[PDB]
């Protein structure tokens, strides 16, 4: 069988499933962006742009 480090090679000859895998990847990345923003908003203190700006937090 395919060794573990080669499992994704089943997509080489399969354009449709490659698009599917790419779509899943894109979904994970956009989901991360959304999650990260929400986590940041849950933690961010907006009360002092002078001495406690975003980059200190």
């Amino acid at each position: 069988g395919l060794p573990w480090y080669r499992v994704h090679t089943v997509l080489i000859n399969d354009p449709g499933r490659l698009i599917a895998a790419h779509l899943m990847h894109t979904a994970l990345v956009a989901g991360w962006a959304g999650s990260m923003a929400l986590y940041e908003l849950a933690t961010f203190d907006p009360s002092d742009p002078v001495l406690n700006p975003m980059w200190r937090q």
Binding site: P46, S47, D48, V50, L51
Partner: protein
């Protein structure tokens, strides 16, 4: 002029009576006579709250807030004596009325500030 059923649910019941643009006259005070305020109404249109900076060296500002307790804010049906003093100044002395309203406003960022909006005594 207007009845309860004309007014109910509109928001007008939280508003004070207004006067015409033409009402710019003068009401004479006779120092021989005693006076009263038969009705005093107060309708808040803005609630501002002073910012409390960590840097107690900057000049702190009063900032706009968002009202969350709806049209429940006005003081009304307030009465008391209107004394005429020696120097001809008038002194209103609040005696009774709907002279307080609990009010909650919200700062930018969501912090709620309850207050007893009042003119008691």
């Amino acid at each position: 002029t207007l009845t309860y059923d004309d007014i109910v649910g509109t928001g007008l019941a939280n508003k004070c009576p207004t006067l015409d643009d033409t009402a710019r006259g003068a009401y004479p005070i006779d120092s021989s006579q005693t006076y009263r305020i038969a009705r005093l109404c107060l309708q808040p249109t803005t609630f501002l709250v002073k910012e409390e900076p960590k840097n107690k060296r900057q000049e702190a500002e009063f900032v706009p807030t968002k009202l969350v307790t709806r049209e429940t804010t006005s003081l009304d049906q307030i009465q008391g004596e209107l004394k005429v003093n020696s120097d001809g100044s008038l002194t209103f002395v609040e005696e009774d009325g709907i002279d307080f309203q609990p009010v909650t406003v919200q700062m930018a960022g969501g912090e709620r500030i309850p207050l007893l909006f009042t003119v008691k005594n």
